[PDB]
Design a protein around this ligand. Structure first.
Ligand code: HEC
Ligand code: HEC
Ligand code: HEC
Ligand code: HEC
Ligand code: HEC
Ligand code: HEC
Ligand code: SF4
Ligand code: SF4
Ligand code: F3S
Ligand SMILES: [Mg+2]
Lengths: 342, 164, 164, 55, 951
């Protein structure tokens, strides 16, 4: 989970640089000392985005490194090649698994979880807020930060499904990742899918309840407009296909769970399309109405970012272990201790 | 150094446009030829100057003070509002070959556009670089700022002041 | 470092051009052309000759501000190689040997004001058709506007009256 | 590239003639045949007062 | 590595005399559309023309100019302007040309001159008309034979029928109450367009003190720029305007003819005949040149009936030197070369191979002439056919003269020595006079000195106008019988093509102009292409389209479904339709035009050129080789059949109707007279149920009390869709031209756009509404709060400061500005290579690199220059005040609007025109519910309809 968070962060974080068209001046959004004496505006939501993605990237990297230090200590201790033992050695920093070191380990890991838990909610609230502070009718919606947070957990749980069913099957980790693991993960995805469907209802209620023409034409152009195909595929994907996950046999069925997670990811992408592109298509002045058609280069960059993600994931599953070796030994201890005290 | 401190020509003789336009006039060949058709022509240091004014090709001078061309400096409003040369160019009157005195930053330009009292002078913008800023530069600067109508820094640090 | 619009595609005041033949983007004045609301309908304002001779008069009456404008325009252009007093003896007259004429001789005191205006405009002398010759002061029509040339003539008269 | 030391010039300069003529402009005085140096800003006031001819 | 390259800098060898370097100079010249020249002020930046403004002293430029005058800069700096004398396409010199011309001259002086022939456009140049008169004196059998495709034959043939003498008609529209336009385009560019538009809109601009507002009737086939501004616009077939005019003569009481019409048309005609004969002397009947000569004859007869002659209609001496019937002179010339009589053919401009009607087959009889001559200004379609093509000097680099619509005869001035060679028509006519190497300076001096004198020539050069000369007033008797003894031709055979000048390309001479092809066409917004124009009923009946054009009919009770059906009526645009005219097949795509007359087709002349430059090398589809010389403007036989093969027809708007929002506020003059604020009160009662909105805002803003706050004012009653303001703000601010591909994507680069909105009942005879949209310069701007590098900020003066060098290109600032006026340099749009295009850039504005934003800055180079001028003149006097005049800043799209709808100035100062305009009750800001507080506000279009068609 930490690894694909870092790799999705590396895939995402190129896009604020890449979408500029003067991308070599990306550091101008960063407050840096210059001879000009200028500053970032700091009330823009892209100015919040730069701090947000940088802090999120750094904290997720920090959590990965402290989560990796004792597994580095094990991999140094079993490497059997002399030069690789130094390489995992300075990676482990000579971790020396011990009390008065494990105390600070659990203490700092629980506390960093306490730092990163509000943080990822806020960083995806700020990814929401780059639409939610804007005056576009489909973008100025007050539900957007918890709704984008729920959509993010929903799409991410889809991706963790789609990339851990092969890790469970092909690499023989069936005992470590049981079927109850996938059951509870489908349950949490079901929770976030209901909150996302509730967010769609909130959008429909905002457009119907309001007497404004612009919210009503938003709902019309989403429902019956030229780009209305994405909204119909959104209610087919992210709403109809999630009601299967209420039943346990659907959750325990591995091919059904994989394919429903794939529909979650595609319809989540469709939700971002409906939020951004469709609301930018038709605006306040009808002279400023135009269709958006992607080129081959948008899809080329999307497939290429899939390549960067999968490449970094494959180096991760090669040089480093993909399951926490410690905290599974601790989980083994906790399981046999529950089996002791009953 | 030889023309202004020694021979003694005022800078509006050659830069004739310094108080009318944004562009202080770069001197033509004819400006040299009022003197140098008689003051040692057939000299090796002036074969380019005598190559011009016979054929029409300009003497290709090299720009010393250079702005990046969307900054839009105006010379006339600086000399007219009591800012003389040698606050922005240094003592050019002593320069045998001219160097840039400081880098033309937004720091330097916004420094005078935020505190114009430190460098403003009681007119005499085009006076030779024998001028020295007095001790009461805060006092005489505030009086000259209020006297010339130098606007508040909330107006002079606007972006469409310089960039356009 | 990025240099985006640092040297723009457009032509600045004296930006060099490869399209024009001489190498100048700034083009010379087209002959016979005048700008909007600027006319040559009065010959005495823009040349010194009404009937073809010297006049000893002015188009506009003299004011103290016009006189001080003539003083400033004298001290920029004219006072180099003529002296602030007007006696010719300046420092350009020492290195080179131009030998400029003093103002306060009787030949110039008897001379009219329109004689002065013609001297500012067209310099004086030209190579004689036989036995050769040279040009001496080369004319200051491009640098001084003709109203300011008449102001220079007025301060010439102030200088001759000051020293007589 | 430190600030250049511009070589202190020698010989006569324009300033000697300039302040000699600046003394010669004001402050009254005599010459070879002229009756008195009427000063500039006094001779200037006189030459506007008796006027130049117009047209 | 160093921060910049060295930047060599080139001074002069001899300085230019009267200019301080770094200060633009303004020169007066003359620019001719169809020979009729409008007085222009052309900015001389460093001795080169950069921006064309209006010369305020001239007739047909009362401050402003039309769009072709404004794009004469990019016409002048076209890289495909002809560079050398070409003998047979191989380069030659002027000396070789003049030796051969002397040989051809002595070949025809032995006879009296039966072989030598000319071909010009309409020459309103008394220098050139004098020179051709001496040439016809030296060669008595030689003839002139002038022609342009956008000619004035029917106004002069109506003069011949009505009075027996070539007269012109000058309409004083400032003293008019009921202007009636039987297929007339006086609010479209042409003869006296700017003066007629200024007079019409000065009677249109309504305040609370205004007690009179005029009423326009236009009866037209093609919707046009005059069609929008009318209170009543009747779409009637161009064949039927003759019958409509005869029926108007019948009802008004003069000798005309009875006619039959549709009941909308017949009720409209009785409404016209009731508004006329109520305003006797205070009415104008105008006919356009498209219409036959009997329409102009009957218009003269009507204008004599209602007392309009001498008070609002003024008959004048012919300003076009010798007037003729130019299409009759054409068929005379083509028959002459068909007989083989023509030996020497001289063409001054005109593009006669391309611009002729195609029934003459002009290029096939062109090769019958052994020695031809072309003065061309572009290596063109005719200069390929003809021998001895001569470079023609552009008017910005030529010495000459041109008469206006009232015969003012202003002097064309060269702001630069001629760029690519350069030989004017006066120099060409002096070469055919016999003497070589005569410059256009000495020729027009020798004509105009000793005619007005040297001291008058100096004033004629300083001011634009000539004081003494004007067209004298004449009052010829009107033959009420000879007009009556004319057929007054009756409409109706079938589908009828109307031939129209293109509103941005005119006759096609401006087809190589990059600005004009990029500029969206009025009422269609089509760029870079030509299209057949249909009514929705017309295309439904003709193309076999499975639609109704009757679900477009209805009231406001089903308005949104009608708008959605009109949106469904789109995406059939671009359907290629094969028509058949009299022998000609054009195969042109169709564009739906809801204002169009039924069974009427509008093909636009000007496209389909082959030998234009890199701009418009094959743009559009040619209308000329189907056009028939017998009836050059319309004809009643057309076979519109479907073809399939849908073409990409590219528009700037895409969406046609305002979708039930408060964008364009419309009123009536009686209720505006009784209550000026009633326009907002009827809007806000439906939206909020309160007469006055209460827009609470969290953000404070700035106060702007003691400052010079710049604001724009646009009068919707006065704007017509002229589109000269878009070309002006393009020329002033170096906005790059993108191709057809980037407007197909939707990335046109226009700082001001015109919104055309088609809103009205029945949706096939709708009310058309043009709205200029620049940036509102929003005091509480949504577009500054989002852009993260603080590149669009507000200043002390309250105007949005878009900094191109700080933009990183987030394009968030696009998404949040609710009017979508910002423009992004998606690719490198600016011309980085072509040196002639580098000369056209105004150096007071940054030329934008790829990846930065763009929007109109309240034309801030002019604001900054006037600010520096005010502060310099304040410190020169010593006042320490810095007071800036109200007329100190005229923005370019204000300075070039012919109707004066755009008004700019300081709004804190109550004495200014813009603050007095903003104090009016029908002033409103666009999208008030977003708390932007615009500085560009709009006056609501207050109409003056009649009691017979609305009440
Ligand atoms: C500032 C524009 C002026 C004015 C008003 C005058 N001068 Fe000159 N001057 C110079 C030289 C070498 C002479 C002697 C001979 C000559 O030029 O042929 C003069 C003399 C005059 C005259 C007498 C008339 C005459 O014969 O020319 C007058 C009326 C006059 N000066 C006025 C040289 C110079 C300069 C050296 C480069 C400078 C600068 C000027 N003059 C400037 C002016
Ligand atoms: C008189 C008012 C001058 C004008 C304007 C320019 N020059 Fe000159 N220059 C002048 C003098 C009296 C002197 C010193 C005496 C001497 O001649 O050495 C100089 C010095 C120079 C020199 C050396 C020799 C010379 O011929 O003058 C050079 C090469 C020189 N100054 C360069 C120069 C240029 C390029 C000028 C045009 C902008 C120029 N000077 C103008 C007199 C005057
Ligand atoms: C102090 C020595 C300054 C330097 C460095 C710069 N400017 Fe300035 N400039 C200064 C003052 C006090 C004023 C006028 C004050 C006023 O009343 O406005 C100016 C004037 C300008 C202006 C005029 C704009 C305006 O007044 O609204 C501009 C645009 C301008 N100067 C440009 C400019 C640039 C680009 C500079 C950096 C090279 C620059 N100035 C420096 C004082 C000083
Ligand atoms: C004149 C006093 C200016 C004001 C006001 C502003 N800008 Fe400027 N800018 C100016 C100078 C003289 C410089 C130095 C050029 C350099 O890079 O050293 C700058 C610099 C900038 C830059 C860097 C340009 C680049 O790297 O492409 C930018 C982006 C910039 N300034 C932005 C900027 C903004 C947003 C301004 C309004 C608040 C602004 N400048 C005002 C001149 C002046
Ligand atoms: C303060 C800021 C000053 C003032 C007081 C003077 N100069 Fe100018 N100068 C200045 C700049 C930024 C530049 C370069 C222009 C640019 O955009 O980078 C210059 C340059 C000159 C030039 C070069 C041409 C030009 O300005 O475009 C000349 C010529 C010149 N300076 C002459 C000049 C004189 C005579 C001055 C005394 C009155 C003078 N400058 C003052 C900045 C400043
Ligand atoms: C002949 C008389 C002459 C006068 C007097 C003179 N200059 Fe110059 N100046 C020149 C010439 C030639 C150039 C262009 C050559 C160069 O860049 O050195 C120039 C250019 C300059 C430049 C270079 C700017 C650039 O970017 O190229 C500076 C700095 C300058 N002048 C300052 C002054 C000042 C300040 C004065 C007034 C005391 C002055 N000069 C007086 C001849 C003169
Ligand atoms: S914007 Fe200006 S030029 Fe264009 S139609 Fe309106 S008034 Fe005329
Ligand atoms: S739409 Fe216009 S007024 Fe609004 S922020 Fe953009 S430029 Fe400013
Ligand atoms: S949001 Fe700002 S970053 Fe540029 S594209 Fe707009 S000025
Ligand atoms: Mg540069």
């Amino acid at each position: 989970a930490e690894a694909m968070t870092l790799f999705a962060v590396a895939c995402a974080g190129l896009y604020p640089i890449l979408h500029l068209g003067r991308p070599w001046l990306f550091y101008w959004l960063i407050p840096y000392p210059n001879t000009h004496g200028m500053w970032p505006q700091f009330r823009s939501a892209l100015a919040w985005d730069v701090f947000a993605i940088s802090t999120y990237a750094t904290v997720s990297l920090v959590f990965w490194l402290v989560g990796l230090i004792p597994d580095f200590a094990t991999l140094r201790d079993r490497a059997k090649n002399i030069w690789v033992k130094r390489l995992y050695g300075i990676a482990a920093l000579g971790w020396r698994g011990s009390a008065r070191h494990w105390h600070r380990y659990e203490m700092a890991s629980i506390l960093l979880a306490g730092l990163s838990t509000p943080l990822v909610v806020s960083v995806h609230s700020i990814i929401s807020l780059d639409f939610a502070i804007s005056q576009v009718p489909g973008w100025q919606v007050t539900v957007f930060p918890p709704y984008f947070v729920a959509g993010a957990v929903f799409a991410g749980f889809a991706m963790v499904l789609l990339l851990m069913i092969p890790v469970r099957t092909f690499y023989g980790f069936e005992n470590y990742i049981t079927l109850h693991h996938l059951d509870v993960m489908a349950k949490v995805m079901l929770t976030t899918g209901m909150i996302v469907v509730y967010g769609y209802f909130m959008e429909v209620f905002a457009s119907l309840y309001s007497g404004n023409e612009f919210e009503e034409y938003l709902l019309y152009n989403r429902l019956f407009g030229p780009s209305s195909w994405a909204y119909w595929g959104l209610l087919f994907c992210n709403a109809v296909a999630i009601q299967p996950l209420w039943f346990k046999k659907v959750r325990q069925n591995i091919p059904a769970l994989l394919i429903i997670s794939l529909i979650v990811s595609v319809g989540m992408w469709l939700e971002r399309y409906v939020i951004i592109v469709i609301s930018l298509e038709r605006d306040f002045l009808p002279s400023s109405w135009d269709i958006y058609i992607p080129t081959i280069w948008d899809w080329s960059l999307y497939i290429g970012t899939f390549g960067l993600f999968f490449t970094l994931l494959f180096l991760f599953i090669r040089v480093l272990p993909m399951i926490n070796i410690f905290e599974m030994r601790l989980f083994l201890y906790q399981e046999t201790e529950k089996a002791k005290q009953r | 150094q030889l023309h202004v401190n020694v021979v003694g020509i005022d800078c509006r003789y050659c830069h004739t446009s310094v108080d009318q336009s944004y562009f202080a006039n770069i001197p033509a060949t004819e400006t040299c030829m009022t003197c140098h058709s008689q003051i040692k022509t057939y000299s090796p240091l002036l074969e380019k100057v005598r190559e011009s004014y016979a054929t029409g090709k300009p003497i290709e001078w090299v720009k010393v003070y250079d702005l990046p061309n969307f900054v839009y400096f105006n010379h006339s409003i600086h000399v007219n509002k009591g800012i003389g040369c040698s606050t922005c160019h240094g003592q050019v009157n002593n320069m045998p070959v001219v160097w840039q005195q400081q880098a033309l930053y937004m720091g330097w330009c916004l420094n005078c556009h935020r505190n114009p009292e430190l460098y403003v002078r009681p007119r005499e913008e085009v006076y030779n670089m024998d001028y020295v800023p007095p001790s009461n530069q805060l006092e005489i600067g505030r009086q000259l700022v209020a006297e010339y109508g130098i606007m508040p820094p909330d107006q002079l640090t606007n972006c469409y002041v310089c960039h356009r | 470092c990025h240099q985006d619009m640092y040297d723009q595609q457009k032509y600045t005041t004296y930006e060099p051009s490869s399209f024009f033949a001489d190498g100048r983007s700034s083009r010379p004045n087209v002959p016979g052309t005048t700008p909007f609301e600027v006319v040559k309908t009065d010959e005495f304002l823009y040349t010194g000759l009404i009937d073809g001779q010297e006049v000893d008069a002015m188009p506009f009456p003299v004011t103290k501000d016009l006189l001080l404008r003539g003083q400033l325009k004298y001290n920029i252009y004219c006072a180099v190689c003529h002296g602030e007093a007007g006696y010719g003896a300046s420092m350009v007259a020492e290195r080179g040997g131009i030998v400029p004429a003093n103002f306060h001789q009787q030949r110039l005191r008897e001379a009219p004001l329109s004689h002065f205006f013609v001297v500012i405009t067209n310099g004086v002398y030209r190579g004689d058709p036989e036995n050769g010759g040279y040009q001496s002061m080369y004319g200051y029509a491009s640098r001084i506007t003709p109203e300011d040339r008449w102001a220079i003539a007025a301060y010439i008269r102030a200088l001759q009256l000051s020293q007589n | 590239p430190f600030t250049p030391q511009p070589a202190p010039v020698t010989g006569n300069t324009y300033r000697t003639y300039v302040n000699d003529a600046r003394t010669l402009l004001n402050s009254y005085g005599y010459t070879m045949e002229g009756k008195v140096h009427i000063p500039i800003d006094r001779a200037m006031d006189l030459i506007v007062e008796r006027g130049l001819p117009v047209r | 590595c160093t921060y910049q390259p060295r930047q060599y800098i080139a001074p002069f060898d001899r300085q230019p005399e009267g200019r301080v370097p770094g200060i633009p100079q303004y020169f007066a010249s003359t620019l001719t559309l169809g020979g009729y020249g409008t007085g222009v002020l052309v900015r001389s930046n460093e001795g080169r023309p950069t921006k064309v403004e209006g010369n305020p002293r001239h007739p047909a430029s009362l401050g402003g100019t039309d769009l072709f005058a404004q794009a004469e800069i990019l016409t002048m700096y076209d890289p495909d302007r002809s560079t050398t004398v070409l003998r047979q396409g191989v380069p030659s010199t002027w000396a070789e040309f003049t030796t051969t011309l002397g040989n051809a001259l002595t070949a025809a002086r032995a006879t009296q001159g039966a072989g030598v022939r000319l071909l010009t456009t309409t020459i309103t140049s008394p220098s050139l008309a004098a020179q051709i008169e001496q040439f016809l004196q030296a060669y008595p059998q030689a003839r002139w034979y002038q022609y342009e495709p956008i000619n004035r034959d029917n106004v002069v043939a109506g003069a011949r029928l009505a009075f027996g003498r070539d007269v012109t008609t000058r309409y004083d529209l400032s003293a008019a109450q009921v202007v009636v336009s039987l297929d007339a385009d006086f609010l479209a560019p042409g003869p006296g367009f700017v003066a007629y538009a200024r007079a019409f809109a000065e009677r249109r601009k309504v305040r609370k003190d205004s007690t009179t507002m005029n009423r326009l009737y236009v009866v037209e086939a093609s919707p046009s720029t005059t069609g929008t501004a009318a209170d009543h616009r009747l779409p009637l077939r161009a064949d039927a305007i003759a019958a409509f005019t005869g029926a108007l003569a019948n009802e008004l009481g003069v000798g005309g003819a009875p006619a039959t019409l549709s009941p909308k048309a017949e009720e409209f005609l009785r409404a016209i005949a009731r508004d006329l004969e109520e305003h006797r002397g205070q009415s104008v009947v105008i006919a356009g040149d498209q219409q036959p000569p009997i329409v102009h004859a009957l218009a003269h007869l009507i204008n004599a009936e209602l007392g309009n002659v001498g008070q609002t209609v003024f008959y004048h001496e012919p300003v076009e030197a010798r007037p003729t019937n130019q299409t009759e002179e054409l068929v005379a010339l083509v028959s002459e070369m068909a007989a083989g009589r023509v030996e020497t053919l001289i063409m001054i401009g005109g593009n006669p191979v391309y611009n002729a009607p195609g029934d003459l087959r002009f290029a096939d009889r062109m090769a019958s002439v052994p020695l031809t001559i072309h003065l061309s200004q572009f290596v063109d379609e005719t200069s390929a056919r003809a021998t001895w093509h001569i470079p023609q000097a552009h008017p910005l680099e030529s010495w000459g003269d041109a008469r206006a619509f009232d015969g003012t005869a202003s002097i064309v001035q060269p702001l630069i020595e001629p760029l690519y060679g350069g030989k004017t028509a006066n120099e060409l006519l002096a070469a055919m006079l016999g003497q070589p190497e005569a410059e256009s300076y000495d020729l027009v001096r020798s004509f105009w000195l000793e005619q007005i004198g040297e001291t008058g020539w100096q004033v004629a050069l300083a001011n634009g106008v000539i004081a003494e000369t004007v067209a004298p007033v004449i009052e010829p008797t009107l033959n009420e019988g000879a007009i009556r003894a004319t057929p007054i031709p009756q409409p109706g055979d079938g589908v009828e093509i109307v031939f129209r000048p293109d509103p941005s390309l005119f006759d096609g001479f401006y087809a190589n102009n990059g600005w004009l092809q990029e500029l969206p066409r009025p009422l269609t917004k089509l760029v870079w292409d030509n299209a057949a124009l249909m009514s929705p009923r017309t295309a439904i009946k003709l193309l076999g389209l499975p639609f109704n054009a009757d679900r477009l009919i209805g009231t406001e009770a089903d308005d949104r479904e009608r708008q959605q059906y009109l949106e469904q009526l789109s995406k059939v645009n671009g359907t290629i339709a094969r028509i058949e005219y009299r022998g000609g097949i054009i195969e042109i795509p169709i564009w739906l035009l809801p204002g169009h007359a039924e069974d009427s087709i509008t093909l636009n002349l000007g496209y389909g050129r082959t030998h234009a430059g890199r701009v418009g090398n094959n743009v559009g589809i040619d209308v000329y080789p189907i056009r028939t010389s017998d009836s050059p403007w319309f004809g009643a036989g057309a076979r519109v059949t479907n073809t399939g093969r849908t073409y990409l027809l590219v528009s700037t708007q895409d969406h046609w109707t305002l979708e039930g929002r408060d964008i364009y506020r419309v009123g009536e003059f009686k209720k505006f007279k009784e209550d000026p604020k009633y326009i907002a009160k009827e809007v806000y009662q439906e939206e909020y149920g309160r007469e006055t909105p209460n827009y609470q805002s969290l953000q404070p803003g700035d106060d702007y009390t003691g400052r010079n706050a710049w604001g724009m004012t646009i009068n919707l009653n006065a704007c017509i869709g002229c589109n000269a303001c878009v070309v002006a703000c393009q020329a002033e601010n170096n906005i790059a031209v993108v191709g057809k591909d980037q407007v197909s994507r939707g990335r046109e680069m226009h700082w001001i756009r015109i919104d055309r909105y088609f809103a009205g009942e029945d949706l096939d005879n709708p009310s058309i509404y043009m709205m200029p949209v620049n940036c509102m310069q929003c005091e509480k701007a949504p577009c500054e709060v989002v852009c993260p590098v603080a590149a669009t900020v507000h200043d002390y003066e309250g105007l949005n400061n878009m900094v191109y060098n700080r933009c990183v290109g987030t394009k968030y600032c696009s998404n949040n500005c609710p009017y979508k006026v910002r423009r992004f340099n998606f690719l490198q749009y600016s011309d980085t290579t072509t040196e002639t295009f580098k000369l056209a850039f105004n150096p007071d504005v940054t030329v934008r690199i790829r990846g930065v934003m763009e929007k109109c800055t309240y034309c801030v180079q002019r604001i900054s220059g006037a600010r520096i001028a005010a502060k310099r003149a304040a410190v020169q006097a010593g006042q320490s005040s810095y007071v800036i005049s109200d007329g100190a800043i005229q923005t370019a799209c204000e300075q070039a609007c012919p109707t004066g709808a755009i008004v700019f100035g300081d709004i804190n100062d109550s004495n200014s025109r813009v603050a007095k305009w903003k104090a009016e009750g029908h002033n409103y800001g666009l999208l008030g519910f977003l708390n932007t507080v615009p500085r560009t506000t709009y006056l609501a279009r207050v109409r003056n309809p009649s009691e017979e068609l609305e009440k």
